[PDB]
Design a protein around this ligand. Sequence first.
Ligand SMILES: CC(C)C[C@H](N)C(=O)O
Ligand code: NA
Ligand code: NA
Lengths: 229, 232
Amino acid sequence: NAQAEEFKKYLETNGIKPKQFHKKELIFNQWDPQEYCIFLYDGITKLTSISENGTIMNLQYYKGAFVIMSGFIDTETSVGYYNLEVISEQATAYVIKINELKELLSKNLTHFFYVFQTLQKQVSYSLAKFNDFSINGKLGSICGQLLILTYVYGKETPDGIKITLDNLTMQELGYSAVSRIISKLKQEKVIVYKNSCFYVQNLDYLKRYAPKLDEWFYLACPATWGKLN
Amino acid sequence: MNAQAEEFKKYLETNGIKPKQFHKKELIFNQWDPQEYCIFLYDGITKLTSISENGTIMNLQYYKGAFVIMSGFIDTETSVGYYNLEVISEQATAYVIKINELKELLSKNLTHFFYVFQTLQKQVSYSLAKFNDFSINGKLGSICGQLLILTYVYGKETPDGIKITLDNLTMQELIAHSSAVSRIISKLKQEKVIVYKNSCFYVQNLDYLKRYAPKLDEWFYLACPATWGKLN
Ligand SMILES: CC(C)C[C@H](N)C(=O)O
Ligand code: NA
Ligand code: NA
């Protein structure tokens, strides 16, 4: 994105430098009282919450470029006890103390608005996920996930749309009640695991069962969406 | 009341924006309008709705004033989704600003920029907590969480329990008339978590709602700690 690149320059102009993280690192954690604004520039992360019994809930995935804020901008207090875990081999992020961010955003409105619109993409993202699940249940949820991977990481090959992610990342994304749906799907030539890649062969099936996430992607990432429509 | 929201209302009126009044079943904005708007919902209760190919109304999200609902992206001014905003309280008051103008107004005053920004932050965290509670407890979590936020916002401690100070019409409305949801609500009533008495509804087992909607309880504690404190 051009808006993302301009934001990166703005931060670096103000002496905020990128930090590199490796897989399994927490860019921020649920036990830290200081809250941060993360500009994830490159890599893939997941937002998790861990309960007192140790169970890890995967709430949301983010890939660069995107913005994730762990505290409220006005109060600087937590928005939820969440971690941001790196699941790609490496990730690059700019890590800004929440108070420090208020100062710099105030001197510039173009860059405020890039972060503002990122929140809007998350709200409508979450609502679309809910809408698709209400209509088509878990199949809808899973189709949406496959759909976004095709749009974001898909590559046209004679064998189909190759999901161009390191194999380790594919495992991190979930690849007994879930097991059966992916089985029916390959059983129906929607996906296949060949040449150590991942291929979608009926993209229309995914659109059918994830219509509102497809619309979300059309409305929020039209340029990406257009690659496969 | 809500001090940060009252200042926003004054800031809008200082810039010449008048409030409009709406009545139940009206759409403040709709999914077919090419122009997108910023809604500052000042008073009343609303729901965000969509329509599928076959004409079924889907209830996606509820909002109550004071709050901000934006139908288009602030930068591109294009739709964030094919949504309608339907009034479900008897009446509602909202300020309706075209999206292109909101950008000017927030740029000239950063206190009020932050008020709208943090409304979005509350939406994001609310949805993640709703998702988390559904993941753990399914649809029971979603309903317990909905009743929990109603209790915190409209509840008043009484000897008969926490009275919900909302008209019974509005309160039954709040997939419409889903068989699955009706049975969950009536089970809570059967177990005396929420009861009908003397024309009002009283939550008598607040702990039960908190147990099954733990992440929305934390969300409310983090987002409105003073209101959370009143009933804890
Ligand atoms: C989405 C929620 C944060 C909004 C809330 N229901 C309100 O109107 O206050
Ligand atoms: Na933190
Ligand atoms: Na519209």
